[model samples]
Target: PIIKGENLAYSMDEKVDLMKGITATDIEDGNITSKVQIKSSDFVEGKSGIFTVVYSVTDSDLTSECSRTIAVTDKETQLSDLNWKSATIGSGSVRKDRAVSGNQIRLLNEDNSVETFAKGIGTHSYSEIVYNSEGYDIFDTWVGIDRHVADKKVSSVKFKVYVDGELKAETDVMRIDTPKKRLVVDVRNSKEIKLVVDVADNGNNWDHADWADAKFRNLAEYDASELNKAIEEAKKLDLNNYTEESSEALKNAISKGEEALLSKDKETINSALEELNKEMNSLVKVDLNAVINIPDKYLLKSIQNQLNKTGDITLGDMYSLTTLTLSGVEDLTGLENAKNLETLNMDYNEVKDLRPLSKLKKLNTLNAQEQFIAAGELKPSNGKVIGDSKVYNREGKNVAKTIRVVDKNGNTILEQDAKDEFTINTKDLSSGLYGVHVLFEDEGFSGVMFYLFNV
Candidate 1:
């Protein structure tokens, strides 16, 4: 007698028919397929997908036996890509890959946008789903109340994660206004994982919650050696040699590099290194070889002193300056080349001519420290505000004949003649720094005094 069978497959939840497509035959009594009897069903009790069915047959008073192996697999990969044991809810049954209301698993993203996921487990409040998480080291998912009830102000629930009956992670009482929260649990030593949703302090009205894109995975070991090398290369470059903007970019990247190195995430570490290398390669160094001649020995000496370099003035020296204080300098030559000066203190120097400083537009504050006016001239008080009429005196007499306000570009904005005092109304003037020029003439003596003000 001889028995023969072949391997077959069936659904994990479905029972297999042991005698399907099985045959038994003998040389004397041929075609005895009906006499074949299942002797033993070697089904692993708790595990799925491995089955060996033994078949026995008797033909011509002789016995022969054979076994068939059948593989059981789920038609649909269920929650977390594993077949779950139980999914129960207090109010209603759990819905696979859909919300409790039988709609697509829609969730509110962190940006408050409606995003839908194809794989998820949807359930109502007071729900629990158990999975046999035996070997997985990580569990990742986005938990929140479904967007189907996002319009409702009171839909609220709390998501909790448990490993081997111990609470591993959970969220606070979440409402419809709450953004979807990402939950990641380290489940290396765990045998089981339970996902639970409980009703918040308020009643469980409209508490349709969901776990979107949930899955179990093993974490990858991260390496930050490249980021460390990039940081070292960045530290090698002198920041003062590059342009301010490019150097600032490299500085910011280096400051964030250490945090990325400590995070142990490969994506973060590599991205940090990428940005650091980009900024390092993009640095614009000053033109140190370009030189400019300074005619005034005093001004040239001041430039060299500010740069701490003893030689002919270079474009790099001027590019590095932000402030300069002159000591007993009578000429203003070579002062215009220091284009980046922010503050200049003259200290009452004899260098009254400032025509060379016209190119230094970055000079915001200039301290003269004394009145440049000689003897008696029509002097207007420097105040930000202006009234209808203002009084002025020169040589203890009201000798101011005319006054005018001009903008910094030397464009005359307002002009007025003095009867008793000059009537200058700045109400119609734009708000900015303006030059107030006053002309005084008394007994064939005329002089002009200038005042700078903001209107």
Candidate 2:
């Protein structure tokens, strides 16, 4: 059997299909594709490198084996291609792409025309050149006294390099007779790089220090514009609509991105932006309102009774509750998110506006009978409590037909007509609380009055 296929190449972002163009044939059985099997494969998913895949085929008593190699490429950002417009110098103005005091950057060589350099920075003594090096892996350059002033005078200067305030490289007192120095320093995951040139023992008479072919290299690229844009976008998000957990995560991501802006490291800045975007995209929006309004204390207690729960009621709790009955309720401001509330009874309540309940999509039944007064008070006499009350509808017409004094358990203690006064003898009842309910007949409304007294 023979396997025919060329080596395949793929990028990290692409999916690998090793068997797409592979074919197998046998001497005894031609085009024996069905009998071909992948004997072994060392290819790993999402990793970049060369790997081998072995194929074998069998026909009757003969077996053939073959192998193919695949190359996976890793996509990365190269720091050498970064723009130098943002590179900074701390002290005095310095020359870029040329020598500080000379026409061109050159080494201490007699044939200056034959010597050439690509990129360079030059400065006199007592000057420092700074570059952000957050995401780069290497900082490479050739340091030397410029050939322009090499023969002018016995120049003397000391060169020093630092990464994040730590001394990384330094040159001894260099003079006109000294040779050009090549400096290579590992700046992996560093934040800053500083190149300093100061006067030596001979003083800075004619020191023109040059950093030729200076460049930063890294496996990943750092983009300041993109990271800054991400931070600005994240800062403007409306966090009120999202869940607490997701909002907190996004907040931290913004902080990390802000810190990365000061660093020019490709990995640190890119990773911070990645995390910020991930957290922003993964934010969980919670449409539930955090506040529910049931202003009247009695109304709140009634809702708590219907829910069989106590303490502060949340919108989520109301959203999941199916049935609710409230008495003496004045407001229903936050029940709009009660999507699961199937049945709601606000009978005998003083709710004037019902527009907030319009958002209940799943609410099927609503009993919002209203009265002019959701609550009232009655004075206790020597041994009894009596009050003349009238219930009116939304149209301002009296609708109270009869009055009934009832306890917390809905037990009627007294009944009378609208023209008569209602009375509750506290001396005859046990020590507790009771309510005076005025029914409005067909007006679809009622009024409630309560008085607390000790027997």
Candidate 3:
């Protein structure tokens, strides 16, 4: 039945059309309001058609249509590069503390070009400047007037002598010697000494104008006889009247003490020790825990020789030594009995095992940053190992699962089911620290091992 035209209906092939005369009626007043509800889901797929709806008798009808489209595309993301820069040098002795002013550091690129990465100056009022580099005081410069001789000649240049800024004597250019020139000016007696070389007839360019580089020497280990003579000369001077002389004397005394220690002579060592003790006792209260500066080269050998000659010498008993840096001192066998040592810095050294420093139980801080420590050789009984695959407590207890061992390039060297006694052939691994992970059924532990490739 087809219904249209005001409730009138007609039938065709026994089908009935639901569309007929439909009207909206008001409940209170018998007025009709025209409106229609539209539904799109009921429409046929892929079919496009417009529908119209009139909300009021005087309003115009609105028509609307809809369609859909679909397409496929790929998405991706890229990572940024790691561009790192060096930090500035802060202040003070690089070994004792961070560098201060006048501290210049150059950081080189992979192609060997250098750039001034950091700069600072020391606050210490003395003319001496300590340049620390790469965590070490690698350079030191001291400026002062040289006073000793009346007329001194450096590099064929004659200069007048000044005592405490007073001109005492002068020499002609003829008196200067060329071949027998000494680099260091000996100012053991004079009150004031200015380093100068005789200018040529032009009287402008002096022969030894660069006085700063003239006196730069490693005075930590010097000849015993020379050091003794310097000490004796320092004693004759009246230190009470001259502050600079007294400071110089103190420096000379420290140098002599180090020389005596290096000389391995019992008498010289005892005498220097006595003098140092007396001098330190006279001045400020010496803190025995202060870190003493010791030259790195041949240090352990020198100490070993001194110890073998004079039984045992407590570093604390002799001088105030808290932090000991042993970078250039490759062999640490001599430190077996150094009991009073607290902080030990062996970074960038050739130490491969922890057995050498195991005797130093008093050590509170240890810097083995770049040093290689092999596993299963000499394990540290302190701190847990946190690395890639396996972890162990300070007591050497293994705690991890799904044991993993990787090469330097992060390629898997060996992976095994986590077990109590796990071992991996690390011969193919490169020389570097590798992460190790040990896995159990659910939990796991991780650690790191330093592998030596060539050696």
Candidate 4:
């Protein structure tokens, strides 16, 4: 095997432009570049190291190969390409050269603006610097339009930035005829930074740009609020219910948070939480069911599909379910066994018995409204509220059915004589459960033509 080449550098989360500038010629093909396969499995993101990327080609029976070492560095490192990070942006084909002075990074911004991000680079289309600033405690920079002194009122441009893949800040087009127009840009965990510049519109003829100052600090400034904010964000994300893809970020926040909490020092917490919050803010809220792509909206939809075997098999994981509502679910069967169900809205399935519910007392509210109806020849069991009976009967004009609400002692507390629809209100009712019974007076009315419920 005879191949030769040097190593390369790649930023994390950046789309790999394989063969963008590398050269590999197969001897079989006589020096004309042909196949180039990059083996980069060993590269770890956000970390800088001498990584050898093997570029091997089978030009002939005797395959030739070359190795290139990649130095994978996050935003903290001085980037080679960053000196000229340019992308054709805006309506016009105007390309502005990037300007960097000392440690500050500056360029025309016109890249995709994250939400609430001012149109970046203020150029027009888009331009950005993708820098991974890993191991950074904080990024301190001043954002504003640049002027060559000659142009006292420099052309206007907006700026937007990202931190760990999250839209962090945006500023409106600052027509910096004056210097005070500069805004302070400071943030923690500024790893994986995308500084974008953009023009306001198609009129990009004179849209000038500048990044006056920018720098980073590995030493952190203690701010407990940041840690507290991260902790609260993690809590709000409800990590217990997060999907596998999003769980890592939450878990990281928690781990870092634990460390931050243990230290109880502003600086210590700041540094730790700087890392934590970076991940915490990057999370995309995902519905576990949605991720699994459940067909039906109901929880039992998956179960029913499994039992039928007629549809795609989908098993939904109900994590920390606080509320459950089902429609036309005849069996209180599996439902009674469910735990932590604080709210339920399963009604009108003629739910006859309370054998399952009476045993389960975890429910905070049972919205059994307008259930248990004896329509036509269908004889519904006569029942009423037992703290279980918010059941109602909307009667038909043709069927003169007498609905009666009877207490546990069997005394009729309320009666709807030949009414269209009637349901008892259990909200302010007495402490004891009640029974509601309905009687039909029509034509031998199919044997036991009645409805019953205990609300």
Candidate 3: C-alpha RMSD after superposition: 47.1
Error of 4 at 325 (Å): 21
lDDT of 3: 0.36
User: CA lDDT of 280 in candidate 3?
Assistant: 43
After TM-score superposition, the amount by which residue 54's alpha carbon in candidate 4 deviates from its true location, in angstroms, is 3.4
Model 2 ranges off by over 4 Å: 11-14, 47-50, 72-319, 331-348, 352-455
lDDT of each: 0.71, 0.68, 0.36, 0.48
Q: lDDT by residue for model 3 over 107-151, one digit each (tens)? A: 223343433322212121112221112211111122121211114
Those runs of model 3 whose alpha carbons end farther than 4 Å from true positions after fitting are 1-321, 328-331, 348-352, 359-361, 373-410, 415-422, 425-449, 452-455
Best lDDT among the predictions, by candidate number: 1
Over 1-455, each residue of candidate 4 has an lDDT whose tens digit, in order, gives 34555333444334544454457555356664556676554654323343446676666555656655444333432233133333445443322233321112233234422112211222332556565666654344445544332254445667776776687667776554523223323344465776667765434434544433344433322335556666776776665454445677668668878787656466777777777767766666545343233333443563443244344322233334457666654445444333455666655434433345544446667765444434322122333222221222112223435667666788887777644456555555565655556543322121112444434
For model 1 the TM-score comes to: 0.33
Global CA lDDT of candidate 1, please? Answer: 0.71
Candidates, ranked, TM-score: 2, 1, 4, 3
Superior by lDDT: candidate 1 or candidate 4: 1
Error of 3 at 342 (Å): 1.9
lDDT for each residue of candidate 2 in 344-367, tens digit (9 for 90 to 100): 788766764455665566666777
Better of 2 and 4 by lDDT: 2
Per-candidate clashes, comma-separated: 0, 4, 36, 59
